[PDB]
């Protein structure tokens, strides 16, 4: 089970990934999550990626490909994997094709979780994160019991530098542009699947699942 989730910022890739991983036991490889972990640890990779992420820009291809090339060389990827938010450019996709060839593996599905931009903006604007456990909240759709405080451990919530409206509009524009040729790339390869992301989280998952169980032909 060798899978990519592709989608604009907020389309639900991580929400789906948790579900996919709980069902199927393949590793979840989020380049965004990897970068954010390095940023929290303030490692050199982290501080390099920070300058891009905080602004809503893509981290450059070379470093991003390299983290993925190293990550996919681990033994937990031998029976499948779930890439989330990689590739984000055609160059990354062409590099993945070569990685996979080297590994003697093929992408089986590239799932585009499609959600219109208006909904994306609403999903993201208002997200808040617990500084201590990383639990997410939303001001509008999932607020904490006490404003600014996490229900689970009392940790202080924050707004990511990239989740304000202006930066979310930017991330949408950057990824809309990069994703157009990338969708073309994988539609040419006949591995592109489309999922309607504008459904409840369980139903998106059922539809994804049907593509993963081979039922949607
Ligand atoms: N390959 C790469 N090359 C270069 N740079 C890279 C890179 N990969 C990462 N980067 C850098 O790192 C940065 C961050 O990248 P990344 O971490 O990949 O961020 P993203 O994909 O822009 O955005 P999210 O992770 O917020 O969205 P998601 O699709 O995972 O949705 P989620 O499940 O969280 O859900 C979001 C919200 O919606 C809600 N929700 C989910 N599903 C539903 C639904 N079905 N109905 C209603 N609400 C829903 C959720 O509860 C939640 O509140 C990039 O901007 C870039 O700088
Ligand atoms: Mg995500
Ligand atoms: Zn917490």
From Swiss-Prot:
Sites where the protein binds AMP: 31, 36, 57-59, 85-88, 92, 160, 171
UniProt cross-references to Gene3D superfamilies, sorted A to Z: P-loop containing nucleotide triphosphate hydrolases (3.40.50.300)
Native organism: Bacillus subtilis (strain 168)
Cleavable signal peptide: none
Induction of the gene: By superoxide.
NCBIfam families, per the entry: adk (TIGR01351), PRK00279.1-2 (NF001380), PRK00279.1-3 (NF001381), PRK14527.1 (NF011100)
Role description: Catalyzes the reversible transfer of the terminal phosphate group between ATP and AMP. Plays an important role in cellular energy homeostasis and in adenine nucleotide metabolism.
Gene responsible for this protein: adk
Top enzyme class: transferase
Subunit structure: Monomer.
Intracellular or extracellular location(s): Cytoplasm
Protein name as it appears in the record: Adenylate kinase
């Amino acid at each position: 089970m060798n899978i990519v989730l592709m989608g604009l910022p907020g389309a639900g890739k991580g929400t789906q990934a948790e579900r996919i991983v709980a069902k199927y036991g393949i590793p979840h490889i989020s380049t965004g999550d990897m970068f954010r972990a390095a940023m929290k640890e303030e490692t050199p990779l982290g501080l390099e990626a920070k300058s891009y992420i905080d602004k809503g820009e893509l981290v450059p291809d070379e470093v991003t490909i390299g983290i993925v090339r190293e990550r996919l060389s681990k033994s937990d990827c031998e029976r499948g994997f779930l890439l989330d938010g990689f590739p984000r450019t055609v160059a990354q996709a062409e590099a993945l094709e070569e990685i996979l060839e080297e590994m003697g593996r093929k992408l089986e599905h590239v799932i585009h979780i499609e959600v219109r931009q208006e909904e994306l903006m609403e999903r993201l604007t208002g997200r808040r994160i617990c500084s201590v456990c990383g639990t997410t909240y939303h001001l509008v759709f999932n607020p904490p019991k006490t404003p600014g405080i996490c229900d689970k451990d009392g940790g202080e919530l924050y707004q990511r530098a990239d989740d304000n409206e202006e930066t979310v509009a930017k991330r949408l524009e950057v990824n809309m542009k990069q994703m157009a040729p990338l969708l073309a790339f994988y539609d040419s390869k006949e591995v592109l699947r489309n999922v309607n992301g504008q459904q409840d989280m369980e139903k998106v998952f059922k539809d994804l699942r049907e593509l993963l169980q081979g039922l949607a032909r």
